[PDB]
Design a protein around this nucleic acid. Structure first.
Ligand SMILES: [Mg+2]
Ligand SMILES: [Mg+2]
Ligand SMILES: [Mg+2]
Ligand SMILES: [Mg+2]
Ligand SMILES: [Mg+2]
Ligand SMILES: [Mg+2]
Ligand SMILES: [Mg+2]
Ligand SMILES: [Mg+2]
Ligand SMILES: [Mg+2]
Lengths: 113, 72, 124, 53, 209
RNA sequence: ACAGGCGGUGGAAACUACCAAGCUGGAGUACGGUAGGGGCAGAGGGAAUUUCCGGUGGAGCGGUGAAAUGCGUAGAGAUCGGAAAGAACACCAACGGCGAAAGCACUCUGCUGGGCCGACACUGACACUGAGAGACGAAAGCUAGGGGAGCGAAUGGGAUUAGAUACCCCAGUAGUCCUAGCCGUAAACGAUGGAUACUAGGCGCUGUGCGUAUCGACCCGUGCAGUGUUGUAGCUAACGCGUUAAG
């Protein structure tokens, strides 16, 4: 699927907590879609990955103040088109939120190798 | 598009104007400043060529694009 | 820039590498210059062709001497001469290609014609 | 292909300690080698592959 | 010889080429084979002495047998410097070498000790290795033939110094300006050597009359 | 007299120049592809070190050509666990890439500059260099406001020494970092100004095409623009340069 002239292709892979239940990630994936689609966006998709253990331990502090040590987590992956001037809200939300641990927004392109 | 003399000035006039608004924020982008003076210089030698060939086109082009005329 | 300044060198460098062909550019001025070297015996043959609308010429050099050359009148300093100061290179072994109002000729042909002009390059 | 989400292609160009191998032993090209660096450095931040050991 | 070994000097004398290997031209050389055999046939009638310089291992014995057919001379082993240029020292070693063969005839070996006879033995053996085909020269040749340019680079230069015409190895390895007579295509095998060597040695025979 | 200078006069029109039209090879634009640590700004990441908090435990630790200063039973060093901070990015890494230089390397994202090639859109010499002038410009240093882990001018102490205001060792301020601005100097070197044409080759490194080919890429063969190493002619006082010239 091609892109319109007004925007290019981005992608996003996240790292979620392992202890989350089913009902939580439904509201979470729904939170980013309505947030990502509220801005200029087209052709949003959502893949899923398991609880593959992490290569190194993690420290994350919630609003309550306590910290937690993790070893496994739920990975998510997005592939979408958004405008260039509508990505910094996404990256901003992927750091303030406590359910998300890491965030890596990449811009994959065509390469002939 | 065409490659006429007045058309090259129109593209540089937008390329120059596009970079002025950028340097209002990223004033420390001195590498782009070196590129800005090129387009400012390329149009200077083209308009210098347009002048001695035909002055009518010069006064009409500078009037619509709001270009400062050079002394001497 | 000066075309003829490049013409004299493309023939010079060919003799240093000791080649036969030159593939020299064709113009209204060079065709007259080359024409003098044919009659004067400095070049064996010349020949014309084209690859685009532009044109070229192909020379044929001779097989311990060296084909000396020199330019005289440059863009930064033009040199003219009257009839009484027409040079005589090496007592006659060389020649001078100079432009008169009646086209370009050899200095000897100017000695008979009685008209000086703009010396451009000496030959020996 | 060559990217961060591919484990099999990236896992065969790392050392036992998780370091990046040289172009000579990998026998890659320039465009290829520069991406193995990026694909690994990206993945390490994601905890898909450890920084050391 | 190859894309990494072709000298740009031979470019006038190249016709085509193939996968890696090089193809020499047989047309231009045929004129020089005539000019060579014409000059060698004409020179041999006046009674001159010639020389051949062959030290390549593949054609060490071929050049040796090549000299027996005519009254020319060969150089089977290395050049050892100053053979023709430093001829005054060569006459000393040849006058020396000529005498030692007469020294062996006498019964003076008996009165010499064991080790002293060995030195004289190894002395004469060393000169035989390098001064074999020259024992009947008695002067300087007028034309000298080169079988190999690379391995015998020194021999080609003393000819240029003394001003002696010569034949060379004009195949793509070397420079063609060093010899006036030019015969390419001799680095292939003995076929390229014997076909040319026997042909030129043949012309010397009828020229001798 | 010649030669040469000034002025007038009648002719020649190649060249310089002028005037009127033409072309596209130089230059540039529009396109379509493409590599890169180009630059600016904002977010993300780990080890390592240091300090503090405690647990464990008990005499040395640390350093040197040898020693001592120093730290330590008021519990050091070492060893697991934890809080925090600052600065810098191993491996990839070179016969490597980009930039006008100075310089740019952990990751991404945004805005943005320049270069290369292809071709059938176009422009019609719109070019080169550049006195003055202007901009950028390593570290060090200065003026305010912050920050300061580690390393470290200065200054102390312990040694080496006839002496040691040094080399060595233990502690360590400014500074090193960030944001505004000044300073405008370096072996700021390729000790080699820029532009253009011509002038044998050999090896291999990128970028982008073409064709062969396994037409899956690859490989092989060539064009262009670059980047390195040998080297012919030629130059050079010599060393050496040598298609990126010091021809
Ligand atoms: Mg002109
Ligand atoms: Mg005219
Ligand atoms: Mg100046
Ligand atoms: Mg500084
Ligand atoms: Mg200076
Ligand atoms: Mg420097
Ligand atoms: Mg200097
Ligand atoms: Mg300089
Ligand atoms: Mg060299």
């Amino acid at each position: 699927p091609q892109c319109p002239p007004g925007l290019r292709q981005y992608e996003t892979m996240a790292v979620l907590r392992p202890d989350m239940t089913e009902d939580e990630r439904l509201t979470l994936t729904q939170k980013y879609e309505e947030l990502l689609v509220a801005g200029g966006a087209m052709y949003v998709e959502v893949f899923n990955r398991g609880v593959i253990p992490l290569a190194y331990s993690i420290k994350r502090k919630n609003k309550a103040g306590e910290t937690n040590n993790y070893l496994d987590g739920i990975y998510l992956l997005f592939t979408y088109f958004t405008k260039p001037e509508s990505i910094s809200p996404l990256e901003a939300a992927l750091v303030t939120d406590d359910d998300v641990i890491r965030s890596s927004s990449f811009k994959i392109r065509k390469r002939k190798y | 598009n065409k490659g006429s003399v007045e058309f090259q000035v129109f593209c540089f006039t937008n390329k120059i104007r596009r970079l002025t608004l950028h340097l209002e924020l990223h004033k420390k982008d001195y590498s782009s400043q070196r590129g800005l003076r090129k387009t400012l210089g390329k149009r200077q030698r083209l308009l210098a060529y347009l002048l001695k060939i035909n002055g009518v086109r010069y006064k009409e082009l500078i009037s619509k694009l709001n270009i400062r005329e050079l002394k001497t | 820039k000066d075309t003829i300044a490049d013409i004299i060198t493309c023939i010079r460098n060919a003799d240093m590498n000791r080649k036969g062909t030159v593939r020299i550019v064709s113009t209204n001025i060079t065709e007259n210059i080359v024409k003098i070297l044919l009659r004067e015996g400095f070049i064996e043959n010349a020949r014309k062709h084209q690859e685009r609308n532009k044109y070229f010429l192909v020379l044929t050099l001779r097989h311990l001497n060296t084909f000396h050359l020199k330019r005289v009148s440059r863009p930064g300093l033009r040199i003219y001469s009257n009839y009484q100061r027409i040079p005589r290179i090496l007592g006659g072994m060389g020649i001078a290609i100079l432009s008169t109002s009646r086209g370009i000729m050899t200095d000897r042909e100017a000695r008979l014609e009685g008209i000086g002009g703009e010396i451009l390059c000496y030959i020996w | 292909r060559i990217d961060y989400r591919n484990m099999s292609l990236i896992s065969r160009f790392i050392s036992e300690q998780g370091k990046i191998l040289s172009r000579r032993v990998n026998r890659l090209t320039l465009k290829q080698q520069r991406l193995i660096t990026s694909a690994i450095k990206q993945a390490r931040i994601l905890s898909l592959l450890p920084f050391l050991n | 010889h190859g894309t990494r070994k072709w000298n740009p000097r031979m470019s006038p004398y190249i016709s085509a080429k193939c996968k890696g290997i090089h193809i020499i031209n047989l047309t231009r050389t045929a004129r020089f084979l005539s000019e060579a055999c014409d000059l060698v046939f004409d020179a041999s009638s006046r009674g001159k002495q010639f020389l051949i310089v062959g030290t390549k291992n593949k054609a060490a014995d071929s050049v040796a047998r090549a000299a027996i057919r005519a009254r020319c001379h060969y150089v089977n082993k290395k050049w050892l410097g100053g053979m023709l240029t430093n001829w005054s020292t060569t006459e000393t070693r040849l006058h020396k070498f000529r005498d030692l063969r007469m020294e062996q005839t006498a019964g003076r070996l008996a009165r010499l000790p064991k080790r002293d006879a060995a030195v004289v033995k190894r002395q004469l053996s060393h000169l035989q290795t390098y001064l074999g085909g020259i024992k009947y020269m008695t002067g300087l040749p007028d034309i000298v033939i080169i079988v190999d340019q690379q391995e015998e680079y020194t021999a080609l230069r003393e000819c240029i110094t003394l001003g002696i015409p010569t034949i060379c190895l004009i195949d793509t390895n070397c420079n063609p300006d060093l010899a006036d007579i030019s015969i390419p295509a001799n680095d292939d095998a003995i076929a390229s050597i014997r076909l040319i060597l026997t042909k030129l040695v043949f012309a010397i025979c009828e020229g001798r009359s």
